[PDB]
Design an enzyme around this catalytic site. Sequence first.
Site, PDB file in Angstrom:
ATOM      1  N   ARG A   1      -5.554   5.707  -1.459  1.00  0.00           N
ATOM      2  CA  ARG A   1      -4.388   4.849  -1.520  1.00  0.00           C
ATOM      3  C   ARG A   1      -4.318   4.191  -2.909  1.00  0.00           C
ATOM      4  NH1 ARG A   1      -4.426   6.945   2.757  1.00  0.00           N
ATOM      5  NH2 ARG A   1      -4.570   6.061   4.850  1.00  0.00           N
TER       6      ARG A   1
ATOM      7  N   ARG B   1      -2.965  11.124   6.737  1.00  0.00           N
ATOM      8  CA  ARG B   1      -2.834  10.390   5.524  1.00  0.00           C
ATOM      9  C   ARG B   1      -4.063  10.375   4.685  1.00  0.00           C
ATOM     10  NH1 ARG B   1      -1.323   4.493   5.696  1.00  0.00           N
ATOM     11  NH2 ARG B   1      -0.353   4.459   3.613  1.00  0.00           N
TER      12      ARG B   1
ATOM     13  N   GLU C   1       0.800  -1.178   0.000  1.00  0.00           N
ATOM     14  CA  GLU C   1       0.000   0.000   0.000  1.00  0.00           C
ATOM     15  C   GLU C   1       0.889   1.309   0.000  1.00  0.00           C
ATOM     16  OE1 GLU C   1      -2.242  -0.261   3.852  1.00  0.00           O
ATOM     17  OE2 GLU C   1      -1.170   1.684   3.990  1.00  0.00           O
TER      18      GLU C   1
ATOM     19  N   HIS D   1     -10.689   4.511   1.826  1.00  0.00           N
ATOM     20  CA  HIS D   1     -10.032   3.787   2.864  1.00  0.00           C
ATOM     21  C   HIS D   1     -10.333   2.307   2.811  1.00  0.00           C
ATOM     22  CE1 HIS D   1      -8.098   2.829   6.781  1.00  0.00           C
ATOM     23  NE2 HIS D   1      -7.475   3.986   6.663  1.00  0.00           N
TER      24      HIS D   1
END
Lengths: 96, 96
Positions: free
Chosen positions: A69, A65, A54, A85
Amino acid sequence: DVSGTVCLSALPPEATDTLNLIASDGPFPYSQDGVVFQNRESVLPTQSYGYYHEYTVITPGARTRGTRRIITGEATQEDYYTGDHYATFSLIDQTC
Amino acid sequence: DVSGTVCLSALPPEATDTLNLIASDGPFPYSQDGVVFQNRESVLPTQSYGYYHEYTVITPGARTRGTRRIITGEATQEDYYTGDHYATFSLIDQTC
């Protein structure tokens, strides 16, 4: 399951930055970048431990963050984006 | 003895995924998918070796292949669910 395929040009520009960093093997902005993604909930195809990793896609203005991703798989061109997420994923098509 | 009949809509959603894979003959996620089920304790009716086959029903969150399986027999729609690693079985009714 994976939601479908999305062109790289249709994702936030920060996704292009992250893919560029993955191709150069960093340096990465976050310490968590590059850790193994366990796929504990079996949303992605089942694979061995360490198949997935990741990386953060920065969210402009966020202190944390955030929720975006890219998950790489070991196969050629196998990269998944999530903007929620890890809830949902799309495969990234770098050719468009 | 088979413990009753269970509607497919009552089972975890991954049981539907497994039945879909069985219908297409895979490709399957695990190398153990599709092996012969020996029916060692005779819980299911006695048949010649090779009559039954087993398939994983993924359990999200588990670190192993878990305890859920579909066992097929040779008759049409002869599909059994176990959630307890072969202790008990139910015949699946795919119409409800």
